[PDB]
Every structure is written in structure tokens, then in C-alpha cells.
């Protein structure tokens, strides 16, 4: 319940708060959503401040005592020990300068407890600006989310789908095209398609990493690097790669592009949106397969968490949210001006949420839905034995001409191929029942 | 770390948690976003459960001691006293059944402390289903957000813009079309346009209320009202209207449409998306008019909150982007219902209620901390209007279009007013008095302000 | 071919072209999409220029021989006699000034063929600017599309759905929630829900018309009305309303808002987007209820419209629901383009008008045309599989609840279990377990298990 | 009119039309948009039908005489001689059945003129389904649009922006952050950023090609390849690669994924949407740069076509359309069921249009706007030299208070910072002219040479 001195008046700050005047001013300025930065974003801001202090100490610009204090305070933030010291709304100044200052002030307060005096700006923000810090922290968080969390969760889901594709390789059923009875497929073939969609999803995330991992650090206020060392960015990136193990982090190809635009986030969101499109198809098919029992398709049983398909519902709802977040990201991305895109906090919220939702729902879908599915094998065969058949596999036995006459008579009389063959008296020396039954076998027709 | 026994086994629940086994199972099944219901949707579930108990009591279906205990517990929820007792993810079963059961369990636990035993399902969920309750609460929350919070916030912003329009009635400046110099307007006219965009926004929200306020309560599992009293819906709506004063709440025109679809939320989101479009135009223009102080337009100065950065225009345009994205998520969920139930309700509810909250809060902040304190560079704006090639056209009938083009070119080159340029080129004569020049170049008259 | 001279130089123009040099420059400047204005937009530009000439004549600003020639030329354009004379890309200068000049030039060329010389700017564009004309024509076209075409098409679909709701009033079936078996409904109730969605869609279009019908005409370059008569807008609107019968057309409430923004198009697109969301639900349910007919739900049969497959000769597909869902997808995309253009005005003018007009008019057209085809070629001819639906309802575990008060919920659960195992009706299963006697007569069971009464049909 | 027949019976067809019964049913079933397939789509269908006939001939399944007649007619269709014989609406059955039958019927009618009888389904559709042919034609058209048309157009725009970046390397000006005056940049640096966005655009398009170029051909009705040779897909793709030179065309990794989903079109549309986002930033900045000539920024002059920024307006309208199309594509993409995604004609319309608009507008922007921009060089430098943003490097010599007084007086009097420092009498005590000129060198402050 203490008081502080801002160069435009007095500021009242909570007693257990490590933030100071500028942060409390942002709290008062932006009461919009009531939600602040996520743990991933706070962690990335701590990682960045420790790396910058390390490079400023290495170049002789910051006294080793001060640098050690920033590095220890930053490590605490990166390890999640201060997730309650970042109270600023997401809907803040569009550079994220408010959250940048919040990080500077918390490090200064942590350092003061350990007996060292740090200036938030002059020491913790040395060689940095209001504008190259928050987008760097955003891209660190997004790249960690892609590489450490999302890709492994998608691989878990891919592996679960692929395991079912192999278990069910010969579980024959009816194909459905336009929702109408089609020629046979196997449940395994369908699951091989779902698994490819997720494998292609991982390919799509991997393809965006060369641009998602681009960091602005070192470009300072406008991209020129004025008031930073010439190699600040390259040096800070190498410390971040060393401390995170994220080899995908890199300096920006062009320091102006990296601050004027957030195109890498727009690109990454498009991969997530494609994954959401794939997941929607997979989840919808699985809840339709599970439907009924009496009124639906009743092809598979879902694990109970008459079972409602609650994890397909959570997946399709997450996909809707990723599609909406993706529209917000593109809207912010397009609306930069000159040297700075000022939609960074909103874009950060949306892409980091999309990563988190897809990671968590993919691992739940894989573990608590896909792994436990059971096929209703005899029902699925009954459906395959009700699919349309074709005459092609009789060509070698009755010839192109009789086969075409079977096809025409089956269509006119609304009969099966098999029954039309029997009815036309074709069972004989050229075609036993056995030969008819082997040629028209529904698992053979699936070409598994 | 207290321990409970379920139909499937044993679950540990936090000691000070008022939720029970079903909520704890939902917490375990849906660790997806780490974000649960918002205050408005918890309040509405409290309002709904209180009105349902009142009606079940009035119809002689529920013992009055139990009904009174539910009503007192539901009032505490509606008053925001238990916002920490709703831990289930937004990304839950798509009917919102898990959150419905969370409400039933919390009410039973609150009642237990006052010495009254309630069964969550048989008593707190009496006459209700797993499918007509959550969407009712969603539409109560959205209707209240629209009528009680957003419309008044938009009226505050309208009135701030209109006050600026009146203050700046005679503040003449260059028009701009295609970003290029155009004939004169006043800042007041421009702000009159902004005010109309916000007044039309209020009309758009008002226009959606006949369908936003439709409640599914009484339709039970599929819309038929099986296992509810025949008049349960109209009775519960009447209690909600009597208690809340929200006369916009109404039974649904068609019980099936009210559960198979959430088209009222899609409709309302379109009104919020239009307001977000309007606010983007208003906020962009204001930050461009404040740009500078040297190399920008330097028309106005914004009040300093954090050379002032336009931080509230940035908040407004970021909120608008969020509303656009939320609007896309809502329409996606809305389209994808099947047969008797749309199972995207928790996601739709999160997005629609957030959109209401962000637009309400940012509209008030923009009105009070940006619009009200803008200051115009009045003399500078008039000098630029008076120096613009766009104003030479009214000279054509005195000096011809080719001499008027030469006046325009020299005025720009020498950074002079059109008036001073006409005098410097020796055009004052019998063909054009000083008085006729000042009439022809009266830029405030060119703006045609009331 | 035939030469001309623009203040920039000599321009070659096709011989049968009624456009002139400014239009030919715009053709050369914007080869982007290869698509120009639609018939509805051309018609509205013709309506507008005819009304402007009438007013300019009435106010003594334009000589009558000149006004009469513009009126006669503008009526030919509004009648669709010149839909090949508007070659400019949609993706043009964002005020639509290129298309406005195209209209002025085509009118001057028509008037020339009758011996009257019209200056495209000074006569055909009198009292107008490059910025209040194209948005006015856009709003006229959109209002016409809403009132004369879309609402009657939606009413036709509403009536077709409501006729099925009545015909199927007693067609009992199992509900589905989460795609899982639920308590009984009727096919008529479900179709009553679809009908309400369309009726609500008409209410949504009607609710947007007070602002969709607002016209910018009279505001000139920046909204101030400089260089027009003070009452030009109300006079032009009066003529348009009298000639067209479009009672929704009105002068804008605020002349700056009507040129700085196109918020009425964004608003109207939201209504269309909501209709696309409703149609998606209706069409999806209908193709699911038609699915199979051996491996799907087989609740209804859709009318056959064309062969489905060479490989599977008997197979017929739900082509109209596919056309409806694809249209809905296009409306939702168009809606995103409209809102993007709407947000990005600057100062006195929104310069996304041609792109917003393309998208809003296409959404109107696709929804009008598909709604009529869906009603006529799909809904009107649906047939229900009444006995299949009733069999499933009478076999459903969901219908045992009404037995609770006679045999208890535990015995009712055992009846459900056994019926679902032995593929029997609930009625038969109650008999097969000897529960008919003291507390439960055979007519009492038939009263409790009346599936149509459980649907609670009005 | 004449009488034609299909499995559903007899149909009246315009006497002279080359289509037959199924096309005419589709003309009556789908009068929705009044727009049919584009030139690119008709070309891809003609290419595919010729390639299928070559492979059927090579495998001895189709008589050489019939394969020759199909190949010749498919070449006339591909070359654009019969576009007026493709009347079917975009909004047709969602597999593109109707447009597949349109191609088969028109090939049969052309072959009949030359005295060869072809059955549209038994000969022209041999070893094929709609479900594999229409998505294959769509992916051929999209891959050709990406490689042959869009990437070269974007390279042209990249090169025009990079040429400006070089030409304007020393054209110092005010930076702008939040629309507010900031420390100096050069126009060249800004254009280098715009060039990077377009180069990255090209990288995004190239990164999607391993999946965009996947073709369904050979999977037939459901993905199983029933009723086709086991190697039909690999043979047909090899013929298409030889004929088109598009090495990016490839057999699908998984035949079921290639028919049950159109995820590669969704992926590709995301690249195009990101390009639209980049082009919006570039075009907005350029029209603001050109604003005025009195009351705006007046940094540059755009070439005339007082000039309105008409190609920036075309570029930002195109971008809005690509964002809309992108939403329609993702909506179709998500809504497949079981063995088939039935949104293909709508998804095809949208992505092919996005390719075309970006290609055409990128070339126009490059040639008729970027190439001809002129910079107000002296004006830009004067404002940079007059900005309060450049007073900071004086703080250590004159103190914060006097640096603030210098900035305030320079703004009020409309003078440079250098002239204001001299006017306030600060030379001698605090610093020398040599030190002043080092500290206020705006080109050096932009970290350019
Ligand atoms: C953001 O545009 C401006 C910002 C500041 C100033 S200022 O007042 O501070 N100052 C003018 C007085 C003398 C000192 C230099 C700058 C002017 C400008 N515009 C202009 O000069 C506009 C202009 C008029 N004739 C021109 C011819 C060529 C290019 C531009 C123009
Ligand atoms: C678009 O901004 C401009 C456009 C043109 C011109 S101009 O050169 O044609 N011209 C300059 C001489 C007299 C002023 C009017 C005419 C200047 C400007 N900006 C400014 O004066 C900037 C400015 C510096 N001190 C100020 C103090 C208050 C307000 C604005 C400013
Ligand atoms: Mg690595
Ligand atoms: Mg069945």
C-alpha cells in the first residue's frame, strides 16, 4: 500500500509488488480485458533481459556486479518465480513498451533485495529500445511453443492415428462420398489419411520456423541499431540459443522488416489454422463414426470420459478459436505503419493461445480418445457388404461384353452385381460361385 | 485436499472448493486453455438457477426450504461472490453441461453450509436439462452486456465525439480524399461523422436485441419440453425480467431453433464487428491527426497518458482486431450445429462476451482519456486550408483557370496563402477587389457548416 | 478500332464501344481481375444519372434538351441495354471514379447518336462529384438486391420449409444431441426450426435496411455539398423512390459518415453472413438425413437431379445441399473482405468501394439464387421414411422414462438394456419381462410409450 | 435443340453445343453465380484428359485410335478453342463431377466431328473418377499459377523495391514509430524492408509447393485406386511433368488424404494471405509517403495514371479480396466428410482468383508505381535535421533541460537543430562546431554511408 514519485505525480503501489511507477501507471491506463501476459511471455521477457545483460557485460558496457544481479533476477523470471508481478493488460501500447518496462522494474526490485541498485532504463534496458524488446520476446515464446510443445504433441497424435491405421488395416467398411454409399475402404485406410493430415501439419509448422524464429533484438527504436553495439543482435541470439537449446532462433534477415512487420506471426498462424482445418475433419469423422447407437452410424466406440463425443467437441471448438485468432493476427499484421507494427501485444496473445490450445487438445485427443477407440468389426463388414459393387473384376471370366450387360441389368432392375450374375444364369464352367465371391470380395475391393 | 467418491471412483477436491466430483472430473478432462467462464456468464448461471428454483417452488414441484436455499445460494453467485468456484475450461463438452453441473454442485455446497441438503441434479437441475440451461445463461449474459454495459459506454463515446464536433464547429481545415488535399471541411464536421458512426452502432445493437434476448429455457433436452412443466419457459423468463429489469429477455419464438442453433449470437457478433470497423476508422483518423510533432499532420494534440504516443487509439484498434477474430470464431461455431443441438456454445459464449467487455471498457477509456482532452492547432489548420491549391477554383470566374493554376503553383512553391499569392502576382484590380478575393477564398464558407 | 485524344494523348477504342478516352485509360491501367461491374451496379448507375439530370433540369441548371437526352440514355442503361459498355476492372481507383466516368461517357455517346452534344463531366456529372456517385449507386443496387430479390427468395424457402413442417407434423423420430440418440421429436418440429431460421434471416435483412438505404448523393467531394444545390440529395432521393418503388432509399443521416465510411455495407454483410450460417445448418442436416441409403441415416429422400457417378451408376448425390454449403462458404469469405475494406477508410473518403460493392452484391445474388433452387429443386420434393423413423423411436432406450412411475427407474433401465441387446421395441421388451399386470395394463403401457405424445407436438 | 441421354434418361441440349446430357442437367441445376470455370481450370482439365488417354494407351487399355482422338481434342480444349463449351456454374456438385463430365462430353463431340466414336465415361473417363480428376486439375492449375505466374511477378516487385533501396540508400529522413517522429532512417532502408517482405513472400510460396503439387490422380472413387491400374497415378504425373515442365507436380503421399481433404489449398491460401498482409503495409506506407502535396507527408511523388494513389488503392483492395477468399477456402477445407471433401469448385475458384489478382497487381505495382517514384530529397533531409528526436546526442554536452529548450525553439521557429543550437549561443562553452556536426549527422545517425 506504499507510494512512489513519477515525473508527473504520486503513484500508490501494492506492498508485495516488485513492479514500480511506470507499471502502476499502465495498470491504471488499460483496464480493458483484465488479463495480462501469459507465463510463456513472462518467461521469454526474463530470458531476453538476462541475455542482454550478459552481452552488455561481455562488451564492457555494464559493470559485472550489475550484470550478475540482472542475470540472477532474469533467471528467476524465466523459471516462473514471478508470474504474479506482470499486471498490465494485453491491450496496452502496441509496441509492448509497457510490459518491457514492467520487466525492467521487477528486475530492479529483485536486485535491490540482493543489495544492488539498478536503473530500470539505463541498466536493465541498456542497448535496447521500447520497440525491439517485446517483439523479440514474442518470437522467442512462439518458437519455443512450436518446437518444444506443439510439434511433439502433434507427433503423439500422428503416432496414435498411425497405430490405428495399422491395427485396422483389414477392417473393411463402406466408403462414403457426398455422405452416400460408395465402394469399400478399410477403417485403417481412413486413419492413414488422418495420420497424413497430422504429419503434413508438422511439415507446415517446420516450414515456418526459418521466419518465426527471426528476432528483432539489436535494431533498437527504428531498425537502424542506433545506441546498440553493431553485433548486439548476433551476440544476444547466441546467448539465447545456448540457454534455451532453440537452434531455430536467429537474427532478422532485415532489421527494418523485423520491426515494421510481424509477418512471421501471420505466416505461423496460417500453419496453425491449416492444422485446425485438418483436426476439424478428423474430429467430425470420429464423432460421426461413434454416433448412435441406434440412430447413427455406430462404426466405432469412443472411450467414456451412450458416450457423448466430448473430446471431438473440444477439438472442433479449439479449431474454431484458432480460426478466429488467425483472423485477429492477420488484421494486426496488415496494419503496421513506417518503422513499427503497433499490434504486437494482441498478435502475441492470439498466436500463443493458438499454439497452447492445439498442443493441449492434440495430446488429450491422442491419449483419451484415439488410443482407446474400438471398432465394431462385424457391423463394419455388414456395411461393406452393402456398398455398391462393380463388374470390372468379372471381365476375365465373362468378358467385357457380358460384364457391361450385367452392369446395365443391375442398374435397370436395382439389383446387386452378384445377384444379377446369378439371375442371368452365368454360374457355370467360366464362373463358379467361389470365383464370383472371390472376384467381388469387399476386402479385395478395398485394395488394402 | 478433501476426498470425494464418484460413480467411477475417488477424486480429491481442494478443501475450500465448493464444487464437487463432477466438476473435478471436468477439470481433469479439459486442461486445454487454463481459462474458465467469465464473471458475466457465472452471474447469469446464478440468475438462471435462482429463477428455476422460484418457478419449481411456485408450481409445487420443489419443497420451499430447498427452493429458498437454492435462491439464496444463486443470489451469492449472481452477486459475484463465487467467481473462484468455476474452474472448468471453456473448451469443455459443447452443450456446456460441465459448467451447468458446476453451478448445481456449488449451489448444493453453499446450501449444505446453511444446514440444507440439496441434490445437484434432482433439486438444483429440476425441470432443466443438460442442453437448455447453458445457452439460456449465455443469452442472459449477452443481453445484459448489450443493454446495461455496452449501449451506455457507446452513448458516453457518442456524447464525447458530439461535444468535440460542437466545440470545433468553425475549426476549418483541408479535406483529404485518397490521402490527397481536397476542399475545406471543419474538424467539427469530421467529428459529427464519427459521432454518427457510434450512434449507428447503438442502433445496430438495439436492432439485434429481439433475437439476442431469446432464451431456450423450458425446451429441455431436444426442444420439446419433455420432463418440464408446459409453461416452465414463460414462468422462468417472467421471474428473470422481474428480478433483472431486462425486458429484452423473452421465450424463444421456436424452441427447436433456440437449441439447434445459436444464430442470435452470430447476429449480435455482426453488430459488434461493425462497431469494431467504425472504431478502427475513428481511432486511425485521430492518431493520424495527432501525428508529429514535425513530420506528421500535426492537426491536433492527444492528451499524454504514458510527442505523446497515441496509446488509446492503439488500444482501440487492437481491441477491434480481437472483436473481428472473435466474430470469425463465433460464426464458425454457429454454422456447425447438428440436428437438435449446437455443441459450440462454451466457445461461442467466451468470444461474444469478451467482445462485449472489450468494446465496453475501451469505448469509455477512449471517450474520457483521449476524445475529451484533444486540442486542435486551430490557426495552423486554417493557414493550411488558406494555402491549398484546392481552393483556387472559385477564382476561375474572375482570372481564368490558367492564371488560377499559376497562383496554385506559386503558393505551394513559396509556402504562401492563395490570398497573399493573388496580391503578390498583381491581380487586385477592377477584375478582382480585395473584398471579392476574401469572399471567393472564405474557406469556412466553402466548408458549408451550419 | 477508332482513335480519340485525352489531355495525355491519342487513345485507341473499339468501334462499337460507347465509352471514350477516360474509360479506355482505366482499361489499360487496371488489368487485374478481368471482371467488371455486374448488371445490378450498371443499372443503379443508370438510375442515378437519370435522377440527377431530372433534378438539374427541375432546378434550371441543365438545359431541357440535354436533360431529356441524359434521361433517355440513363433509362436504356437501367434497362440492361448497355451491359457490354462497362469494361473497367472491379479493382480500380477506390472511389469508383473510373466507373462513374464510364457511365458519363456511355451516356454522352448514346446522346450523340440522337444529335445532342453532352459534356460527360459538365452535363452528365453536373452537381455530382467523383466520390458521392459510386457509393450512392452501390447502396441503390444493394437495397434493390435486398428488397426486390433476396427477401422474396428467402420467403419462398421459408414457405417450402414451413409446408414440410406441416406435412410432417406427426412424423415421429428420435432426436439427436451430440450425434447421439435422444428423446423423440417430429421431422415437422425440426423443419419448423429450419423455417424459423429463414424467417429470422428475413428479419435480419429488414433490420439493416434503415442504414443500407442511406445514399451519399449531394455530399459532393468531401461531404459538405460544395458545388451542389443544398437540397440536391433529397430531390434525387425523391425521384429514385418514385421511379423504383424502393421505399428504403433515404438521404444519409450524416453526409460525412456516408462518404468516410461504408458501415451500412458491413452491417448488411453481417445479416447475409448470419443467413449463410443458418443455411449451412439446414443444408448439412438435410444431406445427413438423406445419407445412405444403406450405410447412412436414410431419414428422407432428396429428389434426384442428375447422375452422381460412372463407377457407381445408381448413386445420386445431395447436389443442392452441396451448392448451398459452398455458397455459404463464399458469403463468409466475401463478408471478411467487406469488413476489411470497411475499416480502412481515411478522413473524408473510404477508398474500398468497388471491392466492397463486388462482394456485397455477389453475396446477395448467390443467396437469392441458391435459396430459390434449394426450395424448388430440393425441399419441395423431399419425402420422409415414416416407418423407419417410427421403428427407431419405438426401439429407443430414451423412451423408458415414462415407465418410471409404474415399474421404477431400475426396472425401466433393465427394459432399455434388454431392448437394445435383443433389437426389440420397448413395448415388446416390457411384455417379454412379464411387467403387464397389477400396476400396468396393456393400454396403460401404450399410453406411456406413445412416442408422438412424448414429442409434445402442438 | 437435340435429344441426348444419360442414366436418368432424355435431355434437350442446344442443337450446336458440344456438351451433352449431364452438362445440360448441370446448366439447369446450378444457375447461381452465372460464372463458370476460368481459362486456367479448363486448360488443366484438357492437360489431364490428354495425359490419362496417353497412359491408358501406353498400358494397352485404350485403342490407339481412341487415345489419339482424345489427345487431339484435349489439346484443342487446353489451347482455349472451346472455352464457350464449359457453361456449368462454379457452384455445382462439390466433387466437380459436372465439370469433369463437361470435359468428357466436349472431348466426345470434338472426336465425333473427326469421325471417331468415344464414350464420354468408358473412353474419355477410363481409369478415372471425378473424385480424383477435379482435385488433380485444381492442383495442376494452382501449382502452375504459383511457379509460372506468381513467383516471377513477386520477383519483379522485389527487384523494383530493391532497386529503390539502392537508389535511395543515402536519402535520410525522419523515422516514424506510432505515427510519431523518431530517430532517422533512409528511404532506402525502408524500401529494403519492403523488399524483404516480398522475398519472404516468395519463400512462403516455395515452402507450400511440396504439398500444393500433390495430385490425387489414380485414387479413383474413394482413394483405393479401384478400377485403375496400380501405377496410373505415377504414370499420369510423369506425363504431366514432361508436358508442363512443372517438376513440383507429384503423386500424393497418401491417396485418402488427397481426396478426403484439400489441406494443400488451405496451406497455399495462407501463403497468399500473408503476401496480402505484406502488400497492405507496403502500399499503405507508399500512399502516405505520397500524400499532400500541401497537408500530407509529401515525402515522395507517385507517377500519374496531386496524383491519386490509384495503384496503392488497387493493391490494398486486392489484398482485402485475398483475405476474404482465404476465409472461404478454410471454411470449405474443414468441412470434408469421410472419403471426399465436397467444396472443391468453390475452393478452386477462390485460390485461383487469389493467385491471379496477386500476380497481376504485383506486376502493375512494380512497373507503374514503384519504378517511377521520386523522392523529395532535400525536404526529407531538412525535416530530419529539424526533428526534436535528434537532440538526444547533445544531452552529454548541453544537459537535458537545454536539449529540451533547443527542441522546443526549433519546432516553434521551424529551424534545424544545428541552427537552433547556434542561435541559443551554445557553441564554445559546451561544444565546438566540429562536435555539433558529428553529433547531429543524421545520415550517420541512420547508420547508413
Ligand atoms: C509534413 O510536412 C511538413 C512538415 C514541416 C514543415 S516546416 O514548416 O517545419 N518547414 C517549412 C518551412 C521551412 C523549413 C522546412 C520545413 C513543412 C512541411 N511541409 C511542407 O513543406 C509542404 C510543402 C510546401 N511546398 C513544398 C514543396 C516541396 C515539398 C514540400 C512542400
Ligand atoms: C503537414 O504539415 C505542414 C504542411 C505544410 C507546411 S508549410 O511549409 O506549407 N507551412 C510552413 C510555414 C507556416 C506554416 C504553414 C505553412 C507546414 C507543415 N507543418 C508544420 O508547420 C509543422 C510545424 C512546425 N512547428 C509547428 C507549430 C505548430 C503547428 C505545426 C508546426
Ligand atoms: Mg535444435
Ligand atoms: Mg440406421
UniProtKB/TrEMBL annotation, chain C:
Active site, per annotation: 178, 309
Reactions listed under catalytic activity: (S)-malate = fumarate + H2O
Cross-referenced InterPro entries: Fum_hydII, Fumarase/histidase_N, Fumarase_C_C, Fumarate_lyase_CS, Fumarate_lyase_fam, Fumarate_lyase_N, L-Aspartase-like
A GO term for molecular function: fumarate hydratase activity
Site (Important for catalytic activity): 322
Keyword Glycosyltransferase: no
Subcellular location: Cytoplasm
Location of the Fumarate lyase N-terminal domain: 9-333
Enzyme type, top EC level: lyase
Complex and partners: Homotetramer.
PANTHER family named in the record: ASPARTATEAMMONIA/ARGININOSUCCINATE/ADENYLOSUCCINATE LYASE, FUMARATE HYDRATASE CLASS II
Name of this chain's protein: Fumarate hydratase class II
Source organism: Mycobacterium tuberculosis
UniProtKB/TrEMBL annotation, chain D:
Annotated site, Important for catalytic activity, chain positions: 313
Domain Fumarate lyase N-terminal: 9-324
GO cellular component: cytoplasm
Coiled-coil ranges from the UniProt annotation: none
Keyword Manganese in record: no
Residues given in the record as substrate binding sites: 95-97, 119-122, 129-131, 177, 306-308
Entry EC number(s): 4.2.1.2
A Pfam family it matches: Lyase_1
Active site: 178
InterPro entries, per the entry: Fum_hydII, Fumarase/histidase_N, Fumarase_C_C, Fumarate_lyase_CS, Fumarate_lyase_fam, Fumarate_lyase_N, L-Aspartase-like
Primary localisation category: cytoplasm
GO molecular function, one term: fumarate hydratase activity
Reactions performed catalytically: (S)-malate = fumarate + H2O
Subcellular localization, as worded in the UniProt entry: Cytoplasm
Family: Belongs to the class-II fumarase/aspartase family. Fumarase subfamily.
Subunit field text: Homotetramer.
Function: Involved in the TCA cycle. Catalyzes the stereospecific interconversion of fumarate to L-malate.
Name the record gives this protein: Fumarate hydratase class II
Record organism: Mycobacterium tuberculosis
Gene: fum
Amino acid at each position: 500500500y506504499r507510494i512512489e514519485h513519477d515525473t508527473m505525480g504520486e503513484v500508490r503501489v501494492p506492498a508485495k509488488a516488485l513492479w514500480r511507477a511506470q507499471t502502476q501507471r499502465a495498470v491504471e491506463n488499460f483496464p480493458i480485458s483484465g488479463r495480462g501476459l501469459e507465463r510463456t511471455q513472462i518467461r521469454a521477457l526474463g530470458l531476453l533481459k538476462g541475455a542482454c545483460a550478459q552481452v552488455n557485460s561481455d562488451l564492457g558496457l555494464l559493470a559485472p556486479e550489475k550484470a550478475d544481479a540482472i542475470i540472477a533476477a532474469a533467471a528467476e523470471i524465466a523459471d516462473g518465480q514471478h508470474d504474479d508481478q506482470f499486471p498490465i493488460d494485453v491491450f496496452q501500447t502496441g509496441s509492448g513498451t509497457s510490459s518491457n518496462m514492467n520487466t525492467n522494474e521487477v528486475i530492479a526490485s529483485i536486485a535491490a533485495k540482493g543489495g544492488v541498485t539498478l536503473h530500470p532504463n539505463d541498466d536493465v534496458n541498456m542497448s535496447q529500445s521500447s520497440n525491439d524488446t517485446f517483439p523479440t520476446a514474442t518470437h522467442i515464446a512462439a518458437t519455443e511453443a512450436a518446437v518444444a510443445h506443439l510439434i511433439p504433441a502433434l507427433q503423439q497424435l500422428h503416432d496414435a492415428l498411425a497405430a490405428k491405421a495399422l491395427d485396422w488395416h483389414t477392417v473393411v467398411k463402406s466408403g462414403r462420398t457426398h455422405l452416400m454409399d460408395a465402394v469399400p475402404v478399410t477403417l485403417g485406410q481412413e486413419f492413414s489419411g488422418y495420420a497424413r493430415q497430422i504429419e503434413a501439419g508438422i511439415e507446415r509448422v517446420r516450414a515456418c520456423l526459418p521466419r518465426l524464429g527471426e528476432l528483432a533484438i539489436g535494431g533498437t527504436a527504428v531498425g537502424t541499431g542506433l545506441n546498440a553495439p553493431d553485433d548486439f543482435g548476433v551476440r544476444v541470439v547466441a546467448v539465447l540459443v545456448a540457454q534455451t537449446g532453440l537452434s531455430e532462433l536467429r537474427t532478422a534477415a532485415n532489421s527494418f522488416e523485423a520491426q515494421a512487420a510481424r509477418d512471421g506471426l501471420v505466416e505461423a498462424s496460417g500453419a496453425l489454422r491449416t492444422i485446425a482445418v485438418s483436426l476439424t475433419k478428423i474430429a467430425n469423422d470420429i464423432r460421426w463414426m461413434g454416433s448412435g447407437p441406434l440412430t447413427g452410424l455406430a462404426e466405432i466406440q469412443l472411450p467414456d470420459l451412450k458416450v457423448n463425443p466430448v473430446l471431438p467437441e473440444a477439438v472442433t471448438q479449439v479449431a474454431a478459436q484458432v480460426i478466429g485468432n488467425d483472423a485477429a493476427i492477420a488484421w494486426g499484421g496488415a496494419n503496421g505503419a513506417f518503422e513499427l507494427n503497433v499490434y504486437i501485444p494482441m498478435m502475441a496473445r492470439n498466436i500463443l493461445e493458438s499454439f497452447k490450445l492445439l498442443t493441449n487438445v492434440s495430446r488429450l485427443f491422442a491419449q483419451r480418445c484415439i488410443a482407446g477407440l474400438t471398432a465394431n468389426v462385424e457391423h463394419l463388414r455388414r456395411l461393406a457388404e452393402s456398398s455398391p459393387s462393380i463388374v470390372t473384376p468379372l471381365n476375365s471370366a465373362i468378358g467385357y461384353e457380358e460384364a457391361a450387360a450385367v452392369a446395365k441389368q443391375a442398374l435397370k432392375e436395382r439389383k446387386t452385381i452378384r445377384q444379377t450374375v446369378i439371375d442371368r444364369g452365368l454360374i457355370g464352367d467360366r464362373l463358379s460361385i467361389e470365383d464370383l465371391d472371390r472376384r467381388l470380395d469387399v476386402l479385395a475391393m478395398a485394395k488394402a
